[PDB]
Structure formats: C-alpha cells, structure tokens
Amino acid sequence: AICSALPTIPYHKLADLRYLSRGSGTVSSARHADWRVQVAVKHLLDSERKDVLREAEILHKARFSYILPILGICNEPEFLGIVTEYMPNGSLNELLHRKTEYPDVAWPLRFRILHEIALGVNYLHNMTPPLLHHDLKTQNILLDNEFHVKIADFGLSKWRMGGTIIYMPPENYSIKHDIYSYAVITWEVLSRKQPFEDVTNPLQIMYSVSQGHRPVINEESLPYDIPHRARMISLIESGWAQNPDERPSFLKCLIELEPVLRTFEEITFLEAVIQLK
Amino acid sequence: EAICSALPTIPYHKLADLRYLSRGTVSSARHADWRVQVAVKHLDSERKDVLREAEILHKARFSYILPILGICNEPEFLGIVTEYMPNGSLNELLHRKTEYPDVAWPLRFRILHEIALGVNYLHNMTPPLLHHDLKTQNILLDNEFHVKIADFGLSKWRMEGGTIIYMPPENYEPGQKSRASIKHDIYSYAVITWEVLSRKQPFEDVTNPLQIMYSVSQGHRPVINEESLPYDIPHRARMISLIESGWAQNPDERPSFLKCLIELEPVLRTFEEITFLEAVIQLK
Ligand SMILES: CC(C)(C)S(=O)(=O)c1cc2c(Nc3ccc4scnc4c3)ncnc2cc1OCCO
Ligand SMILES: CC(C)(C)S(=O)(=O)c1cc2c(Nc3ccc4scnc4c3)ncnc2cc1OCCO
C-alpha cells in the first residue's frame, strides 16, 4: 500500500562524468549537480533497455543496509543508466588481492565483511518472492567509506517463482547456488589466495569441481592462527558440498557466524579500517 | 513508466528482544528472519499519522535520511521499523561532555555538511518536502557517526510539543504562510550550527522558554562572542556568516541549502580523510 517511486535523473544533472571500469556494463563516477553528492553510473538497443530497467527495478525493490543503494534512473533517448551511491573503497576483490596497497586486513574486518555478505544475501532470499543473486563474486561485493558491504550486480539475479566460473556450483554447468558462491568467497577472504592458483585453463577448474574437488584447505592456504578456524572450515565445506541438499540456508549460516562476531569488540573494527588508510 | 517499491509489512511477532529506549515510544529489537538490530517507533486518527510518517520516510530515502525497514500494521500493534542507530542523537553527542570530552572539528564539520545534504535532498524532491521540526534531538548518528535525519511528524509536502529554540520567529503564530514557508529549515539549521560549534545550550542564561520567544521575536539570537565561539574554531568567520544569514529576522534574507552547501564544500576539503576516522575512535 505504501509505494516509493524511483527518481528520474536528467543526464545533464550528472557533472564531472569520468570512466571507472567496464564489464554488466560501463561504470563511471560523477557528482549530482543539485544533490551535491558523488554518484556512480552504470550504462542503442531495445532488448538492452529492458535489461537496465529490470536491474534498476530489482535494486529499488531490494533496498537494505547491505545492498548497493540506487539513487535514480537515467532514462533519456540519448542516454540510459543506473545511478547509485559511490563506493570509495572499491570491491572485496581489490582489498584481498592488492597485498602491496593492503599488507594487513585484520581478522575483525574480514569477519564483519563475511557477516554483512551473509546478511545481504539472507535479506534477498527472505523477500516475497525470494530474490536469488546467482552471480556472487568478490568483484561485486563493494566497500563503502568505512568498509561496510554493499552487494551489487543484479543482472543475473532471479525472482524465485560470461566471466569467472570459480563461484559457480557444479550443477550449473536452485535455492542453493548463492551459498556455494559464499563458501568460495569465505575461503578467498580467509586465505587471500586466488581459488585454484595452479590452474591454467578455466575448463580444468570446471572439470575438477564436477569431480568434487575444491580450493585447497591446508596449513598453507588456511594457517592454524586464523580465529575460529575449525568452525569456518566446517561452514566452507558444508557451503560448497557437491550435493546441493547438504548446503546450509543463509539463516543457518548466520546463526553459525553470530557467536563468532560477538568475540570482537566494536573498536577493533574501527582500528582495522584506520590501519588500511 | 514509474518503478514503484512497496514498503514491507513486518509481523510484530518477528521482532525479538523488544526493549524500551525512550518515550511516540522508541524500542530496540532484532528481526528474527533478517538477523539485524532494528528500532521501533509505536485510535484511528493516530493510525493515519504513523502511516503518513512511514510513507514520507519510504518516499524520502537518501544517504542522510533515517532508512525505514518496514511497518507494523496489526490490530494489536502499530509501528515504524527503521535501522538501529547505535550512537544516539546529535543532542547527546554535544551535551554529554562527561561521556564525550572531545568532539573533533573534522567530525563536527562532517555532521553539519551531512545535515545540509540531507535537508537539501528533501527540498529538491517533487514536490519539495520541508522537515519543519529540525532539532539536534532528531539528527541521529550511525555506527561511524554519519548523520540520519529522523522525525517527519511535522514535515510537509510543498503544495503536545517540545522545544522552540529551533523555530523561526514568524512560525510562533502559525497558519497557511507558516506551514508554506520554505525558509523554516534554514533557521533551525543556523541554530544547530551554532550549537554544534559551541557545544552550548542556545539561550542558556534564559530560564523560561516564553522569554526566549520574546527575545527571538525582538531579533535576539544565541550569543556570538569569544566565550561561545572561541577564535580557534576552524573557518570561524565563514561559519559565523552562515549562522547569521541562516537565522536572519527577514526570511527572504536566509540562504537556500544549495548556497549553504557551496560554502561548506571548500571547508570540508581542508580535512584529510584519516581525521574523520581519528575523531570517531576518540569517541569510543
Ligand atoms: C568495482 C570497481 C572497484 C572495479 S569500480 O572502479 O568499477 C567501482 C564501481 C562502483 C559501483 N559500481 C556499480 C554501479 C552501478 C551498479 S547497478 C548494479 N551494480 C552496480 C555497480 N558503484 C559504486 N561505486 C563504485 C566504485 C568503484 O570504484 C571506485 C573505487 O575504486
Ligand atoms: C534518540 C535517542 C538517542 C534518545 S533514542 O534512545 O530514542 C534512539 C532512537 C533511535 C531511532 N529512533 C527513531 C525510530 C523510528 C523513527 S520513525 C521517525 N523517526 C524515528 C526515530 N532510530 C534508530 N535508532 C535509535 C537509537 C536510539 O538510541 C541509541 C542509544 O542512544
């Protein structure tokens, strides 16, 4: 009964428009001339038009604390795009793998990111009807100014009625896809390693995965000093199980993570972030 | 053509660990399915009012506006579910000097910038939304002390009470013109700015509130001197100019939030990013 409409932003209101990246399309940064804030813009064909509008509708409907906030839609004959909040700290991929820029990523912050990814996905799954992301990667887990999570890219997302394959369950070559992706992300967050490092061809990964092989769990990838190592390994191994029926719900995953997050005092999250600056 | 998002209905029984915060009445809880902490603000005429506020919060969604999560609409219970703000209000930050001996200038300037960003957004909506009850009490602070504007009970679409220190003199005897005024929020903002930079209670030496009303209507304002506003305040002259134009007796002489923002942007650029992080750790 209470309906909020997504604003239409005239393209001419986006000042200092600059290229960022390219992929479910091109990302550019800008400032809104009237709102005085920094924004991000994700931008001829008719079928491609419906796709951008579909994504915008999904982001607008799926608004929550751990979902990338949509500010409006650019819907002009000359230009079509999605306006969102600008995320100054990039993606989780950049945080994990830029080891020169980030020598230390403290455990409290790693656990908080993992908790917020699960909170964000759980919300999507609890919607009516449930929304299934179906394209979770470290690349589309964005980080705001204080390194809080914002889930982006709802291009492959589906209402319950390409690129990299390392986050894709073997049966995809389902309400149990996002958990598989999450298990791989957890492994990657705790190891700062690229899954299947020794693999030349992505087909060799697809073959290994279909045979039940997974990123390695040993002392080298996951050192014995990782807080709650046993519990995290259990979560990872259940999450990426060959049998989808054996993978947990996000609820179960969240009930598992809540006692872990309670072991960290609030100031340790602040200290982890200042260490990155 | 319009993309319309519906506000969720939350069954009251999905709110676990419901605990009293303040007195409508504010309670804290956790959503049983979403696994997050929330806040709950809870007759037929009083029903229409809660729904009106919820509609406004849902439509006015922005980075510096309190995010609404859903509505409780049951025969047995009616309330607004929002994100939980762990660091309270700006009032508590400014006046709890034992709990907060220092509040660094970078953080004070960021709060002022975010309040102006939040109000500017409301004023730029179609039709414009005018808050008309801005107080330090309803500028809420999140986990990293970012601003969230709350209380849209007196808010109006441009087409039982408390404090009056943020109210312009022309609004004392209300009507059509008063409810219409597009220069009310800037007056409130000028008083908030003065209060943020001084950490003083506006009209501290005045005992009775009706006497404040008498002074304000004569053109008297909270004092601007070396005691209230020390000479060491960054960008003191510029801030005093903003304050004095914002609370001008003539509403026509008060600036827009755009003008205000354009003045604040060069000020905020003088603070390095780490100083905001340091200001927050100092508060913990
Ligand atoms: C992901 C990055 C870090 C490589 S980026 O430079 O592209 C970047 C992207 C941002 C972004 N992307 C975006 C925009 C609109 C939509 S609609 C659905 N998903 C998206 C995703 N949004 C916000 N801020 C971004 C910041 C980025 O990098 C700047 C810091 O490096
Ligand atoms: C304002 C306080 C700090 C005195 S509080 O204890 O009441 C408090 C309020 C919070 C809050 N309020 C709220 C809830 C729903 C609506 S709908 C329109 N306006 C509101 C305002 N919202 C979120 N978190 C709150 C936290 C509070 O206390 C934190 C500890 O001081």
* Domain at B204, CATH number: 1.10.510.10
- Please count the structural domains in chain B: 1
Q: Residue A87: which of A45, A162, A144, A164 has the closest Cα?
A: A144
Question: For the residues of chain A, what is the DSSP string, one character each?
Answer: --EEEPPB--GGGEEEEEEEEE---EEEEEEETTT--EEEEE---SHHHHHHHHHHHHHHHT--TTBPPEEEEEE-SS-EEEEEE--TT-BHHHHHH-TTT-S---HHHHHHHHHHHHHHHHHHHHSSS-EE-----GGGEEE-TTS-EEE---SS-EE------TTS-GGG---SHHHHHHHHHHHHHHH---SSTT-S-HHHHHHHHHTT--S--STTTS-TTSTTHHHHHHHHHHHT-SSGGGSPPHHHHHHHHHHHHTTS-HHHHHHHHHHH-
CA distance A66 to chain B (A): 11
Q: Ligand 2: which residue has its CA nearest to atom 21?
A: B150
CA distance B261 to B117: 7
Query: Cα of B186 to ligand 2 centre, how many Å?
Result: 23
Contact between A2 and B58 using a beta-carbon 8 Å cutoff: yes
B269 at A interface, C-beta within 8 A: no
- Chain B neighbors of A270, CB-CB under 8 A: 144, 277, 280-281, 284
Position in ligand 2 atom list of the atom nearest CA B41? 15
CA angle A71-B184-B241, nearest 5°? 95
**Cβ atoms within 10 A of the Cβ of A210, count?**
12
Beta bridge partners of A159: A131
Q: Which of B5, B67, B121 sits opposite A61 (nearest CB)?
A: B5
What's the domain range around B127? Answer: 1-284
CA angle A220-A224-A225, nearest 5°? 115
Contact between A5 and B4 using a beta-carbon 8 Å cutoff: yes
Q: In whole angstroms, how far apart are CA B218 and each of A164, B135, B192, B202?
A: 70, 22, 20, 16
Cα B128 to chain centroid distance, Å, stands at 17
Query: Cα of A56 to ligand 2 centre, how many Å?
Result: 30
Q: Which of A4, A36, A271 sits opposite B117 (nearest CB)?
A: A36
- Chain A neighbors of B284, CB-CB under 8 A: 266-267, 270
CA distance B282 to chain A (A): 10
**Residue B91 CB–ligand 2 contact under 6 Å:** no
Is residue B133 annotated as a catalytic residue, yes or no? yes
State the maximum Cα–Cα separation within chain A, in Å, rounded to a whole number: 58
B33 at A interface, C-beta within 8 A: yes
**Cβ atoms within 10 A of the Cβ of A211, count?**
9
Q: Residue A10: which of A87, A76, A99 has the closest Cα?
A: A76
Beta bridge partners of B139: B149
CA distance B2 to chain A (A): 6
Q: How was this structure determined?
A: X-ray
Query: Cα of A87 to ligand 1 centre, how many Å?
Result: 6
Resolution in units of Å: 2.6
**Residue B171 CB–ligand 2 contact under 6 Å:** no
Q: In whole angstroms, how far apart are CA B266 and each of A31, B230, B238, B262?
A: 15, 21, 11, 8
**Which entry of A46, A51, A135, A144 is annotated as an active-site residue?**
A135
- Mutational test site, ligand 2, from B49, B89, B143, max ligand atoms within 8 Å of CB: B89
**Do A216 and A166 form a contact (C-beta atoms < 8 A)?**
no
CA distance A114 to B51: 35
Residue A236 is encoded by which pair of tokens? 């990872």
Beta bridge partners of A22: A26
Task: Kindly list the protein residues whose Cβ atom lies closer than 6 A to any atom of ligand 1.
Answer: A 20-21, 27, 40, 42, 68, 82, 84, 86-88, 90-91, 94, 142, 152-154
